[PDB]
Ligand binder design. Sequence first.
Ligand code: A1BQI
Ligand code: ZN
Length: 139
Amino acid sequence: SGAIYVGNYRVVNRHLATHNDWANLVWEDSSRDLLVSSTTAQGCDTIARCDCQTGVYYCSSRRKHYPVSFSKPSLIFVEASEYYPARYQSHLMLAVGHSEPGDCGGILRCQHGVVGIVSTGGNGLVGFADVRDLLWLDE
Ligand SMILES: NC(=O)[C@H]1CCCN(C(=O)Cc2cccc3c2OCCO3)C1
Ligand SMILES: [Zn+2]
C-alpha cells in the first residue's frame, strides 16, 4: 500500500484504488496501473522533473529503503493477475531489488523528488510506475 499526495491530488496504484478514490476521480490509466483522485487537504510531497536513473525506494515487506538503478520508462509485458489480463504496462521502470505484492504503492525518490510508485515485481525485480511526465500534478 501507499500513495503520493501533491497539491489537491492523491496518486495511487489503480488496482488498489478505493470507493472514495473512484468517487473523486481525476484521471486513471489501466495501461499504467495509475489512478489520481482529488483531495480537500493540501498534500505533503514534491514530484521530480528529471531523467534520473538512480534513486531510493521504500520496501514495506522489509520495513527498509533500498538504493536502485532503474531502466527508463517503457512498455513491458506483465503476466495476468487477479487485477488485469496479460498485457503491456506502459511508463514502467525496472530495477533489481526485493518486492512482494503488498509492496505496491511504495515511493521511489531521487534527489529531485518523487519519481514513481512500486507497481510490479518478483524474482528479485521491482517495477515502478513513473509519474514524472504528469506535469499537471503541479497545478
Ligand atoms: N502492475 C500490475 O499489473 C500488477 C498488479 C498487481 C499484481 N501484480 C504484481 O506484479 C504483484 C507483485 C508486486 C511485487 C512483487 C511481486 C508481485 O507479484 C508476485 C511476485 O512478486 C501485477
Ligand atoms: Zn532526479
